[PDB]
Each structure stands twice: as structure tokens, then as C-alpha cells.
Amino acid sequence: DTLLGRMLPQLVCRLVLRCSMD
């Protein structure tokens, strides 16, 4: 699941991480 982050870490992960916890 880190492979995707290895492309959009400042967007997909950003929204996802924020979504899970603010």
C-alpha cells in the first residue's frame, strides 16, 4: 500500500492520513 504513496504522498496519503485522523 506504500507503493501508491510512492507517487502521491502529498495528496493521496495527505487526504487519507487526515481522513483517518485530524
UniProtKB/Swiss-Prot annotation:
Q: Where is it localised?
A: Secreted, Extracellular space, Surface film
Superkingdom of this entry's organism?
Eukaryota
Q: What else is known?
A: Pulmonary surfactant consists of 90% lipid and 10% protein. There are 4 surfactant-associated proteins: 2 collagenous, carbohydrate-binding glycoproteins (SP-A and SP-D) and 2 small hydrophobic proteins (SP-B and SP-C).
Task: Cite the record's note on assembly.
Answer: Homodimer; disulfide-linked.
Instruction: Give a short account of what the protein does.
Output: Pulmonary surfactant-associated proteins promote alveolar stability by lowering the surface tension at the air-liquid interface in the peripheral air spaces. SP-B increases the collapse pressure of palmitic acid to nearly 70 millinewtons per meter.
Associated disorder is: Pulmonary surfactant metabolism dysfunction 1: A rare lung disorder due to impaired surfactant homeostasis. It is characterized by alveolar filling with floccular material that stains positive using the periodic acid-Schiff method and is derived from surfactant phospholipids and protein components. Excessive lipoproteins accumulation in the alveoli results in severe respiratory distress. Respiratory distress syndrome in premature infants: A lung disease affecting usually premature newborn infants. It is characterized by deficient gas exchange, diffuse atelectasis, high-permeability lung edema and fibrin-rich alveolar deposits called 'hyaline membranes'.
Q: What is this protein called?
A: Pulmonary surfactant-associated protein B
State the organism named in the record. Answer: Homo sapiens
